[PDB]
Amino acid sequence: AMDPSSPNYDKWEMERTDITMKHKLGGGQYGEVYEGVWKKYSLTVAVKTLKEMEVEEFLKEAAVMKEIKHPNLVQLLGVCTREPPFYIITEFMTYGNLLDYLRECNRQEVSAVVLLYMATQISSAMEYLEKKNFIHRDLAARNCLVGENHLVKVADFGLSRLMTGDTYTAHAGAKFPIKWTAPESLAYNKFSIKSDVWAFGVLLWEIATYGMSPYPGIDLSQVYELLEKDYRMERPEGCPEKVYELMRACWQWNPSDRPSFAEIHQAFETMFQESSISDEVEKEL
Numbered sequence: 564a565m566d567p568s569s570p571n572y573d574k575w576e577m578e579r580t581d582i583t584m585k586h587k588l589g590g591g592q593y594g595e596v597y598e599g600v601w602k603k604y605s606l607t608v609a610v611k612t613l614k615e616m617e618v619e620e621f622l623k624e625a626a627v628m629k630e631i632k633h634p635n636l637v638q639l640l641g642v643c644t645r646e647p648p649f650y651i652i653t654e655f656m657t658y659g660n661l662l663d664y665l666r667e668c669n670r671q672e673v674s675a676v677v678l679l680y681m682a683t684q685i686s687s688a689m690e691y692l693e694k695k696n697f698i699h700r701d702l703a704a705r706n707c708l709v710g711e712n713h714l715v716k717v718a719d720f721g722l723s724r725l726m727t728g729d730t731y732t733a734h735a736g737a738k739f740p741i742k743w744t745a746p747e748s749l750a751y752n753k754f755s756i757k758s759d760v761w762a763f764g765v766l767l768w769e770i771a772t773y774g775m776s777p778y779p780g781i782d783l784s785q786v787y788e789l790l791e792k793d794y795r796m797e798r799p800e801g802c803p804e805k806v807y808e809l810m811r812a813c814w815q816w817n818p819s820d821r822p823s824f825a826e827i828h829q830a831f832e833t834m835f836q837e838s839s840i841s842d843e844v845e846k847e848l
């Protein structure tokens with residue numbers, strides 16, 4: 564099986580024994596994900612397993628990750644799926660999730676230039692997924708990771724029934740993150756790359772505020788109705804007008820009127836080619 568000679572060969576399949584399983588990750592906030600070590604590489608990894616009908620979504624997540632490779636998407640390193648317990652192994656990201664990272668970070672270090680950089684990296688991963696005709700479905704700061712030198716990667720932790728609190732709430736027989744969810748997704752169950760664009764705009768606001776909770780002090784039962792009547796979050800303090808214009812574009816009612824990720828990414832790279840975000844932020848302020 565493990566030998567290139569076999570018909571049953573999969574390059575992604577690895578030796579379970581090759582990995583030393585340590586403790587659960589982030590105190591359990593990610594479910595059955597464990598810090599690990601790849602012995603031979605002396606490399607920390609993150610290892611997702613199954614806890615005791617649920618097999619095929621896990622195997623399909625494995626299937627999908629084999630299909631995608633981007634600098635800004637968390638990288639599959641291997642699998643153990645020949646026999647239970649099934650593993651999915653990715654790289655481990657030193658600074659953990661972007662949401663907590665934003666709230667806990669030193670702001671002298673994580674300045675406007677670094678925030679812009681973080682938003683840019685995310686838009687590139689999304690450009691890639693756009694181009695490969697994938698949809699993310701739960702784009703948000705809580706689903707991104709941060710490594711060395713402000714490297715940001717887009718992940719998908721499957722958080723809807725793992726996260727405690729009111730982030731995800733019951734809607735349509737399932738748990739939605741209501742404050743990140745595009746109107747057509749809440750109203751008509753319509754999910755697409757353009758509804759990832761809406762969530763990206765909310766993600767952008769999370770970056771701009773250092774991970775404040777969106778629509779702060781607004782009841783969830785009121786979000787759709789406000790949105791339908793053209794309400795949007797106001798420009799965060801310090802936010803350059805152009806970045807806010809970009810947020811406003813992502814939050815078009817009609818999905819078709821939302822920029823594609825390629826255009827979003829193109830705007831980040833253009834927006835400050837001749838003027839620094841630092842000057843704009845200080846101007847705003």
Ligand SMILES: Cc1ccc(NC(=O)c2ccc(CN3CCN(C)CC3)cc2)cc1Nc1nccc(-c2cccnc2)n1
Nearest residue numbers: 593596609610611637651653655656659697698699718719
């Ligand atoms: C261990 C593992 C197993 C699987 C995954 N998977 C993904 O992150 C992922 C990313 C993108 C897609 C693309 N996909 C397209 C289709 N739509 C519908 C879903 C998303 C799928 C899975 C990540 C991990 N990594 C992971 N998980 C939880 C926590 C951590 C972690 C925590 C702290 C520091 N370093 C790493 N790391």
Ligand SMILES: O=C(Nc1ccc(OC(F)(F)F)cc1)c1cccc(CN2CCOCC2)c1
Nearest residue numbers: 674675678679682767770771800801802803806
């Ligand atoms: O950096 C800021 N905003 C911002 C917005 C968008 C943005 O672009 C992108 F693409 F989203 F990343 C980048 C940065 C910022 C926010 C609050 C306070 C201060 C400085 N002040 C310090 C003293 O106290 C008062 C505030 C700066």
Ligand SMILES: [Cl-]
Nearest residue numbers: 696697698699
């Ligand atoms: Cl998809």
